[PDB]
């Protein structure tokens, strides 16, 4: 099987094990890269991704739909801001994981909605994901407005400097509280105790039975009354066996 030799293949190149990410589609989507360069096989593909850093680090990039924006699905931010804020606050800083966070805008929503949250003792938010060039770019943490366009303008005001027309910059008083790392979800050590995990729009990809072994190892990061913030396409089943309660949609807490 051609795909089965060319996923041993990534695997031994990036670690990442596309026999964790649905078939049919992480199939079509590779297939239709290898093509637009021309590529007659995942034979040759594989063959250039061995030769050609850029043209591995560009299809890790290219892997997902990645594109992303600043509160993303707005009203689940309130939501956050609203119902689950309460629940996991505490006397002690919270530990935040954006995991999955593309090039950034999750976690500098998180920390922007964060800091305005008078009086939390503080906020420390790791923001992880296996596409360097996506690192890279959230390290930098410009964007440009169309990834802006639900942010509150005091907000935008208050936390990035606007460089020109439609490009602005976070503010190092919102970088200094995340730490951007390179993590495989579906490989790597999981760091423990977190008052709150946002991973959206990412399980997505990955199999059922993946995705079943990332939500358990989810709760075990979470600290007891911490919560786990999904997708708004994404939803874990009997939670309960997970020891997870739902708290509103796409918020699950850990009893
Ligand atoms: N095994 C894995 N571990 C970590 N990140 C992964 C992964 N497989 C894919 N990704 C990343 O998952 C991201 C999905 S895009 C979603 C970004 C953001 N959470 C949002 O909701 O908009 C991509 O950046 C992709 O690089």
């Given at each position: 099987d051609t795909y089965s030799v060319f996923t041993t293949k990534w695997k031994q190149l990036?670690?990442?094990?596309?026999?964790?990410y649905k078939e049919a589609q992480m199939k079509r989507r590779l297939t239709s890269l290898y093509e637009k360069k021309g590529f007659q096989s995942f034979k040759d593909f594989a063959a250039a991704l061995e030769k050609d850093q850029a043209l591995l680090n560009e299809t890790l990039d290219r892997m997902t739909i990645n594109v992303s924006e600043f509160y993303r699905n707005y009203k689940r931010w309130e939501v956050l801001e609203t119902a689950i804020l309460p629940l996991i606050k505490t006397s002690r800083p919270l530990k935040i994981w954006s995991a999955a966070?593309?090039?950034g805008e999750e976690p500098y929503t998180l920390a922007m909605l964060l800091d305005?949250?008078?009086?939390?003792?503080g906020y420390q938010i790791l923001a992880t994901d296996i596409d360097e060039k996506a690192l890279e770019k959230a390290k930098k943490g410009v964007y440009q407005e169309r990834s802006l366009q639900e942010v509150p303008l005091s907000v935008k005001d208050r936390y990035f400097?606007?460089?020109?027309?439609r490009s602005y910059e976070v503010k190092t008083e919102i970088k200094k509280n995340i730490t951007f790392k390179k993590h495989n979800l579906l490989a790597d050590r999981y760091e423990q105790d977190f008052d709150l995990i946002v991973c959206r729009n990412?399980?997505?990809?990955?199999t059922e039975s993946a995705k079943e072994e990332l939500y358990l190892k989810m709760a075990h990061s979470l600290k007891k009354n911490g919560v786990l913030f999904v997708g708004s396409t994404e939803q874990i089943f009997n939670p309960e066996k997970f020891g997870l309660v739902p708290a509103d949609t796409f918020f699950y807490q850990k009893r």
């Open positions: 990036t670690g990442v094990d596309l026999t964790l966070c593309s090039t305005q949250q008078k009086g939390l003792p400097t606007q460089n020109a027309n990412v399980f997505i990809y990955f």
